[PDB]
Design a binder for this molecule. Structure first.
Ligand SMILES: *[C@@H]1O[C@H](CO)[C@@H](O)[C@H](O)[C@H]1NC(C)=O
Ligand SMILES: *[C@@H]1O[C@H](CO)[C@@H](O)[C@H](O)[C@H]1NC(C)=O
Ligand SMILES: [Ca+2]
Ligand SMILES: [Ca+2]
Ligand SMILES: [Ca+2]
Ligand SMILES: [Ca+2]
Ligand SMILES: [Ca+2]
Ligand SMILES: [Ca+2]
Ligand SMILES: [Ca+2]
Ligand SMILES: [Ca+2]
Ligand SMILES: [Cl-]
Ligand SMILES: [Cl-]
Ligand SMILES: [Zn+2]
Ligand SMILES: [Zn+2]
Ligand SMILES: [Zn+2]
Lengths: 396, 271, 271, 396
């Protein structure tokens, strides 16, 4: 991986810096590294592909070195460099694609393609140079068994789930108490509803709770909390739990009461915010506990008093919502997020070449299944393929 | 009772209307004047065959007759899994019909009221006094802390406050938190202290003619018309029964299974 | 009917007897002579109170009376969730006792028979002909492969072979695979072609006095004597009823819920 | 691991071979290896950690070389060697214990304790010599991504499960048809019971099927198959599936008819055995399918015909059994088995020092839970700890 990344970085620097008219002083070290790469790769045969519809390709390296006596680069030097750069870039892209489409259960972190396994030999470490990208940096930290870290803007940590729970229910579904939620990506919209508006509640208060378990620990997370769940603030007909029938939800929104968002790590309360909305910080957590209350308004105007009668029928159903959005976070494991494209790259490469479903990832690289059962083996394979995808993105 | 967790992505199941029609019974309650006007001894069989065309198995639809609203209100016994009451409208009985609805469209937990030994009070808005019999004349005398009476003398029933006279059914609502001495004709009336638990989903009332006058809630600020309170204009009873048969699926859709666990002694007509 | 997979370590649930009594009902069937000997106008009330001491809520236990075994055998309707039939033993009515026990202790799937038009045969050992009514007299004429009577004349009903005379209930078991012409008093009794599906687990029969003579299987080689067929010795009916009440726990233990889905809507009690 | 194994092997060889009076020619290579170990370890400071109640221990190595120039080993030589060997054996045992009690969700195949991580450095590679044990051989094969093989006698492959399936049932439980089984260790006992004795079956034959999906592929397996299952041939009172009630089982054993044992790999029939009992060979499989039949005896003596009436009540219930014992097998993964002691050693070491439950193994190293969810991370950690346990057992 380090050798493949170094090949890609050398090629990218060659593309960027070997330009017409530039002082040789601007590329001397780069030209030395490039010639070292040529020397190391010369006489080596590689084979990529042979999986799915990815074609089998044979790579031979017999290249001359670049000149070193120029003061300023000219057209001839640039074209001579560019021929070799094109061949090497094609080789690196094919190696990256071959590695992105393979997976193993026991040793998924290790290289899978024969080309990368061959490149993992000692003699190729001469190619190795600056490893500055975030993903290669984390790869090297992981290989050294140091603490790793990935910054995610809107991390896709919550698998898609639009569900509900009815703590009070009847077959006719006319006096319902419960809570409905959507967890999607970095978003958690929850809404606790009481059809009776907590008229019979002990203190005219109904307590609603929502616990969301994150499959990985998030640190240095910035979250925005808002007091309404727009997703569950309009009337809708919702299937029954068994699917036998459907019920009617007719929300009327009241502000949530005694809002308390707790961020927990291993069952211990790390962060706690009561009646706090806007931007909050969760420094380290793996579980979120949103506990809110529906409080019956003790004083009501005639219209509000008309909304909520003493007994059934209950035509307007009191609802209190919370919205939680993780805008940024840091995770020791790789995750899909809104800003990056590694998941998209891996899925695109797997789809374009009709890679058969492997024993590790879910079919079609579907993210909800992947994050629902994010096992250590899946984490290893995902880190490998994401690092390969970033390396490929340097060039392609 | 346990929490029920459901996914909003679950697929709808097929129509269960045919299965519930096959595995449930329907009771139709009509006034005797309906049978009089129809003037046919086989109309039960004809309606059963029409319901069979609608899907109900032969013998699942039970036809029950009552003389009038007043007589029907004396301890009505609803048997089938689905009960439909064709209630004739009378401008003079607006309360009575309403009372009948209030007794059959809601679940009631009732206990005996031996008024000769105890003075009774209504603890909350759900508490009422349901009296049923051939003749229910209920007089009320609100009492004070010394249990003597306000505007009434406990001994003199004449001075009592009249809340019902010659009634087959009456739902009495007095001011809560006050003890009352009750004088009822226990020979021809039984009075029960009752709490309304909630709607009774398996009973629908179709008002034949008139307007919307039903008020199944004692609260003056609410007169809610649930989906189980239908109202149809009429001139012939055959048309009434034909519209009941044709829209039977709609009527049952507005109704649900009873879902209540009881402790009382009533027979049922079930399959 | 889906397979049920269970683990042999699942913890036992607590006793469901209390909730079962609170949510089920018991029908006790006794002969008229029982009430005649008891000679009390409220023995039902005291029996219900004793049952309440035993657990059953008031109004849950039902008491049904029948004149005798023969009369009770004419289309017996069993209402409650649990049925206990106190059958007195008469040494001269052993087959009638066996027939009643066979009818009410087993589940039967019956269809009508037109003895006038078509010939009939019994497919297998589970197939019988149950005829009941005010008076059942059944004569049988077995036919040969050319639909000609054997030892009997199709035209002449006098040559038929008599299998029942003046019976109120009789189970006819003829040779299987042979078509028979049936002469039945259809004007006073109905014969139905029935198949024995299985046991009725909610009906127990307590034989009062006598010996074990019941035979609910036509096979000569089996006299099952299932756990739902009890027998007791008696001199007074009050002792019999006290024994029934005291050991109602065991009696219900011997019975299970019906568990059969019926396509016919009949009258039952269900709490 | 190879360095730790080589330390243990050198110490075991020294203990076995350095004995009073023995020729030096019998130990020359052993003495050279021992002196190499002393030189490599001299001057190095090691620490075995304080995880759980395991004491913190510090090890310093300053030892003279074992002497040459003896024709036959004398008592002084053996005494000096015994002193050095005792210290080294204590160090190796403590290192093995420290490694046996640690685990990681990811990279669980790598060393966990600081001592073994230090031993994994290049400078200690000199200590490495003959790796002949099965576990170290398979460890080296796994390191190189080669085919791995562990031979087990009575492999612990089936998690404990005493369950039943009622294909025909009702609340009274007087006419039941189904199967009941115990799968434990290398043993499967199954029994198909019919209360009606197939009186109403299409041809008086009731078909019973039992599928056991092994969580690892077994190869070169010898299996004893016996007709009857003694575990399900006596009267029982068995709880209902939901635990509400108990039903009665009163077996009368009929011989199983049309027995069919299929050993399947990836849903493909690898081996088939029809009406075969005794020793059979399943060469490569991961699923077992036992299809047997209860055939009603066409002819029954009066005593037999009394047990099987035409209709209910069915007081005697006809049962057909099958016993299947895996006497020995080969698996690419590590498993517990009757003969070896790796699982027992690891569990004993964890229990002795009250090691808190980690994120990889079930509490108490429960084998049923371990093999029910034998995940790749669990496989890596289990192979690591089992190899360390086998290394320790060479000396302790
Ligand atoms: C439901 O209806 C569909 C469409 O007619 C039919 O294919 C299916 O078998 C029905 N039953 C179920 C259980 O889905
Ligand atoms: C069951 O019985 C046990 C022991 O008698 C008792 O503690 C428990 O509350 C009962 N109910 C349940 C639901 O376990
Ligand atoms: Ca009235
Ligand atoms: Ca007055
Ligand atoms: Ca009141
Ligand atoms: Ca009102
Ligand atoms: Ca008879
Ligand atoms: Ca004759
Ligand atoms: Ca027959
Ligand atoms: Ca018999
Ligand atoms: Cl954004
Ligand atoms: Cl053995
Ligand atoms: Zn629901
Ligand atoms: Zn052995
Ligand atoms: Zn069961």
């Amino acid at each position: 991986m380090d050798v493949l990344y170094s090949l890609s970085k050398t090629l990218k620097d060659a593309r960027d810096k070997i330009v017409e008219g530039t002082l040789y002083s601007n590329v001397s070290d780069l030209i030395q590294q490039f010639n070292q790469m040529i020397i190391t790769m010369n006489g080596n045969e590689f084979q990529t592909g042979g999986i799915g519809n990815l074609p089998i390709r044979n790579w031979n390296f017999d290249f001359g070195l670049l000149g070193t006596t120029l003061l300023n680069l000219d057209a001839n030097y640039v074209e001579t460099a560019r021929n070799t750069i094109d061949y090497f870039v094609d080789f690196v892209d094919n190696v990256c694609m071959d590695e992105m489409v393979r997976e193993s259960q026991r040793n998924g972190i290790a290289p899978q393609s024969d080309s990368l396994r061959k490149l993992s030999g000692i003699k190729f470490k001469r190619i190795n140079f600056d490893n500055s990208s975030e993903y290669i940096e984390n790869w090297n930290l992981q290989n050294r068994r140091q603490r790793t870290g990935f910054t995610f803007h809107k991390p896709n940590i919550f698998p898609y789930s639009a569900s509900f729970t009815l703590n009070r229910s009847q077959p006719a579904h006319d006096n319902l108490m419960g809570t409905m939620w959507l967890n999607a990506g970095s978003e958690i919209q929850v809404a606790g509803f009481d059809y009776s508006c907590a008229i019979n509640a002990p203190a005219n208060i109904q307590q609603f709770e929502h616990i969301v378990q994150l499959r990985r620990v998030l640190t240095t997370a910035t979250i925005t909390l808002l007091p309404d769940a727009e997703r569950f603030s309009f009337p809708r007909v919702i299937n029954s739990a068994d699917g036998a029938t459907t019920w009617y939800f007719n929300p009327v929104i009241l502000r949530p009461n005694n809002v308390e968002v707790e961020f927990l790590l291993n069952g211990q309360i790390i962060n706690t915010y009561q009646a706090r909305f806007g931007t909050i910080i969760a420094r380290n957590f793996d579980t979120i506990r949103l506990s809110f209350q529906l409080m019956r308004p003790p004083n009501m105007t005639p219209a509000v008093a008309a909304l909520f009668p003493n007994a059934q029928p209950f035509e307007h159903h009191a609802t209190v919502g919370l919205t939680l959005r993780i805008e940024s976070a840091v995770c020791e494991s790789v995750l899909a997020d809104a800003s990056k494209t590694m998941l998209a790259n891996v899925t695109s490469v797997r789809q374009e070449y009709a890679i058969p479903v492997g024993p590790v990832f879910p079919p079609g690289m579907n993210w909800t299944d992947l994050i629902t059962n994010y096992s250590p083996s899946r984490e290893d394979n995902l880190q490998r393929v994401f690092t390969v995808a970033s390396i490929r993105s340097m060039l392609v | 009772n346990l929490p029920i967790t459901g996914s909003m992505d679950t697929a709808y199941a097929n129509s269960t209307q045919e299965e519930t029609f096959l595995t449930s019974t329907l009771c139709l309650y009509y006034p005797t004047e309906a049978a009089t006007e129809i003037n046919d001894n086989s109309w039960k069989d004809t309606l059963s065959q029409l319901f069979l065309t609608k899907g109900w198995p032969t013998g699942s639809v039970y036809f029950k007759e009552y003389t009038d609203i007043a007589s029907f209100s004396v301890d009505p016994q609803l048997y089938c899994d689905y009960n439909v009451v064709l209630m004739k409208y009378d401008a003079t009985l607006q309360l009575d019909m309403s009372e009948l609805a209030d007794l059959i469209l809601n679940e009631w937990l009732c206990n005996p009221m031996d008024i000769t030994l105890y003075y009774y009070q209504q603890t909350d808005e759900a508490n009422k006094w349901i009296s049923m019999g051939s003749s229910c004349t209920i007089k009320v005398c609100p009492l004070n802390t010394q249990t003597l009476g306000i505007g009434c003398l406990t001994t003199d029933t004449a001075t009592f406050e009249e809340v019902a006279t010659a009634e087959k059914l009456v739902i009495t609502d007095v001011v809560d938190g006050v003890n009352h001495k009750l004088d009822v004709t226990t020979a021809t009336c039984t009075i029960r202290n009752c709490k309304k638990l909630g709607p009774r989903e398996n009973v629908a009332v179709i008002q034949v003619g008139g307007s919307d006058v039903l008020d199944i809630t004692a609260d003056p600020t609410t007169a809610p018309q649930t989906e189980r309170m239908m109202r149809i204009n009429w001139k012939k009873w055959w048309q009434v029964f034909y519209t009941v048969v044709d829209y039977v699926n709609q009527i049952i859709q507005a109704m649900s299974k009873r879902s209540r666990s009881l402790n009382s002694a009533a027979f049922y007509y079930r399959i």
